[PDB]
């Protein structure tokens, strides 16, 4: 429970919706890497870690086991379904906002359960695609998750953005607005 | 209204005083409920919930499974820790400090730093200010950087110099950013 | 290097 450093080697996730899985390694609550199960390749999130190699067959055989373990628990628990938890959406900038200077907008979707969400960037109803990236689902102690989405921007006084979050825990898509000021 | 069934496995390593204390807590979860776990300190599987009692009883009866789980503290935790000693634990990103009036309020933006250890102190003419200060919690950007915003309710006069004092492990000496009326 | 922990099969589905 209490230590200097906590790591997950790794976060093995598998669920019936899709079905889909997720394999990651975390160190002090940040995503070290993820394995692309489809492409069968390791994607590092911190550049100094790119010097290392992670056999993707560990992730694939691990998820293959979790697929077995899940079906075993679906049966054992007379199909006790996951509860749709209301996620927490917060939008903020990576650095102080100046009208000239370029920045990044961070959209944090916290308390994600079950881990199935759509995080989209909008600007006056139109969707932003260029300059948007995402983290994997990052684990939490309560066995819930969180995801972050980054939108590169050039702050302007008349351009505002929205973070559209679609989760079953929400009755209507949540739109978190960001006004440049 | 989609029904989801989630299974998680987390191979968690807890480290303290570098190499001195190491603990492996392998957690098996269905959906937000930890059902069974292998703790390096207990040295055997134990059920967390009556759903994991069949898994704990099966895996504990297999000496082969039990002995590989007992070797994992050296195989996964101690071994992976040596890679962090050269990479993630060598990472130091010096904080960018900035003061901007938001005036009756001063905001000290302490952005893009790593690791999390930080101290931010406000000062009005070399005397420390505490009563009129409010800080954000430590914000995780998710891109292996943190940020913290420290506000101070001020009422300035001619001759007042507001100072933001910031301490971080990456720094040789603390950073002091001034602001004048 | 980096090494992963391994989940084992649940009995028996």
């Amino acid at each position: 429970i209490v230590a200097d450093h906590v790591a997950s080697y790794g976060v093995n996730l598998y669920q019936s919706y899709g079905p889909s899985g997720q394999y990651t390694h975390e160190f002090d609550g940040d995503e070290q890497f993820y394995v692309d199960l489809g492409r069968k390749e390791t994607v590092w999130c911190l550049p100094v870690l790119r010097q290392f190699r992670f056999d993707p067959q560990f992730a694939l055989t691990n998820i293959a086991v979790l697929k077995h373990n899940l079906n075993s628990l679906i049966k054992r628990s007379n199909s006790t379904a996951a509860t749709n938890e209301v996620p927490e959406v917060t939008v903020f900038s990576k650095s102080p906002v100046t009208l000239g200077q370029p920045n990044i907008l961070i959209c944090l979707v916290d308390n994600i359960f079950p881990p199935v969400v759509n995080i989209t960037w909008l600007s006056n109803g139109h969707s932003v695609t260029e300059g948007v990236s995402e983290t994997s689902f990052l684990s939490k102690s309560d066995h819930s998750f969180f995801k972050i989405s980054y939108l590169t921007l050039l702050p302007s006084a008349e351009e505002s953005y929205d973070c559209k979050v679609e989760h079953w825990g929400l009755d209507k898509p949540l739109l978190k607005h960001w006004e440049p000021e | 209204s989609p029904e989801d069934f989630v299974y998680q496995f987390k191979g968690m390593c807890y480290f303290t005083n570098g190499t001195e204390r190491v603990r492996l807590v392998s957690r098996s979860i269905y959906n937000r409920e930890e059902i069974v776990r292998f703790d390096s300190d207990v040295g055997e599987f134990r059920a967390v919930t009556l759903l994991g009692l069949p898994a704990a009883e099966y895996w504990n009866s297999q000496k082969d499974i039990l002995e590989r789980k007992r070797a994992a503290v050296d195989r996964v935790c101690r071994h992976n820790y040596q890679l962090e000693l050269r990479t993630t634990l060598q990472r130091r990103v010096e904080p960018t400090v900035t003061i901007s009036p938001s005036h009756n309020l001063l905001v000290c933006s302490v952005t893009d730093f790593y690791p999390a250890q930080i101290k931010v102190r406000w000062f009005r003419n070399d005397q420390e200010e505490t009563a009129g200060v409010v800080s954000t919690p430590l914000i995780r950007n998710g891109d292996w950087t943190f940020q913290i915003l420290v506000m101070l309710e001020m009422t300035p006069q001619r001759g007042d110099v507001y100072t933001c004092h910031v301490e971080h492990p990456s720094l040789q000496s603390p950073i002091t950013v001034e602001w004048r009326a | 290097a980096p090494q992963p922990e391994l989940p084992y099969p649940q009995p028996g589905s």
Partner: T-cell receptor
């Protein structure tokens, strides 16, 4: 233990053969090998659940394995050739890539003739 | 890590049969596995270990402190213990590969 059927199979070239393996109860990893003499253990394919992560190791496109199960496995050699002759061994562990013990079956002695 | 073993050995029934194996280049995650094969059937798993000493009802396994050498002990040799003995260095990533083994012969 691991079961294998048929124990023996003497066939003419060009005819298709189907080899079967019944792994140990609770063994999610299944391995297929072949062994000639004078020669050693030759890896063909393996399964984790009902999917084969290592399809390389198979001698030709004539060779294919299945485990729809994912318990019982079947290896099929369509249009058999002389060089296909060997003892086809099957093995099973609890799980793959965990350095778990592989328990072998009695084998299938396949002999293909011209 | 590869293993080395005497090509063949002739031991008398009624006494323990110590079969040596050298593996100077063993890595920390590699198990010392022993299989046997009777002319010519499915290979039989006997025993394995990491650092400790292990005892089956089939055999015992002694691994040196440095892990560079190991011994398989057949408690009480019988005519049935006549087989080819394979000492293997096994880790997760790897596939099972047998060497030349020891052609053990148990003489009456």
């Amino acid at each position: 233990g691991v079961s294998q059927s048929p124990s023996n199979k003497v066939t003419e070239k060009g005819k298709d053969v189907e080899l079967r393996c019944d792994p140990i109860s609770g063994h999610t990893a299944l391995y297929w090998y072949r062994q000639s003499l004078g020669q050693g253990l030759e890896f063909l394919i393996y399964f984790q659940g009902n999917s084969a992560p290592d399809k390389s190791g198979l001698p030709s496109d004539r060779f294919s394995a299945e485990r729809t199960g994912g318990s019982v496995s079947t290896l099929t050699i369509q249009r058999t050739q002389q060089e296909d002759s060997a003892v086809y061994l099957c093995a099973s562990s609890f799980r793959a890539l965990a350095a778990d013990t592989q328990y072998f079956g009695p084998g299938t002695r396949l002999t293909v003739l011209e | 890590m590869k293993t080395t073993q005497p090509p063949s050995m002739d031991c008398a029934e009624g006494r323990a049969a110590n079969l040596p194996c050298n593996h100077s280049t063993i890595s920390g995650n590699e198990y010392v596995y022993w299989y046997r094969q009777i002319h010519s059937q499915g290979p039989q798993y006997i025993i394995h270990g990491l650092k400790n000493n292990e005892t089956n009802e089939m055999a015992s396994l002694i691994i040196t402190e440095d892990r560079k050498s190991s011994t398989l002990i057949l408690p009480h040799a019988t005519l049935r213990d006549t087989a080819v003995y394979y000492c293997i260095a096994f880790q997760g990533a790897q596939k099972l590969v047998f060497g030349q083994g020891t052609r053990l012969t148990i003489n009456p």
